[PDB]
Amino acid sequence: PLGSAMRELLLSDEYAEQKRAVNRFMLLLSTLYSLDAQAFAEATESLHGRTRVYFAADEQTLLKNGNQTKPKHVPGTPYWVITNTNTGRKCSMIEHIMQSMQFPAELIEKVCGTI
DNA sequence: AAGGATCCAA
DNA sequence: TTGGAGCCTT
């Protein structure tokens, strides 16, 4: 059901249209949220750095728990995510979320490679 | 400004 | 051996 939407996303025109890791990163998130805004929330409450906070309803909250985190507003959602990270960390975040929303590792790996 | 590999710390 | 983030090329 959800796996379908994601798989459709990677093939979508606008996904292929994003030109940078971040944009693709945002889109995956935006999409994972609209899929199950509920499950997304739970997967989210359990995702954070060793000192940095990753997602938060307000920006200052990200601005308050780390230095030069690049808070960006996840379009379509009530969440903000940090952006000062390498593609490896981005996949790690996506990976953490999808795992929570219990996705097939196969597809999960498929997504990261597109980031 | 912005993105994100690179590099350093824990 | 995972995570932070100043830093320098777009």
Nearest Cα to Cα of residue A82 among A108, A44, A114, A115? A44
Query: For residue A93, which amino acid is it?
Result: M
Q: Which residues of A27-44 are buried (b: 16+ CB within 10 A; e: fewer)?
A: bbbbbbbebeeebbeebb
How many other C-beta atoms are found inside a 10 Å radius of the C-beta of residue A87? 14
| A46 CB neighbours strand C below 7 A | no
Domain A1-115 has CATH 1.10.10.10: no
**Is the Cβ atom of A96 within 7 Å of strand C at any atom?**
no
CA/C1' separation A4–C7 (Å) = 40
Name the token pair of A1. 């059901």
Report the C-alpha gap between A34 and A47 in whole angstroms. 18
CA dihedral A9, A114, A110, A13 (to 10 degrees): 20
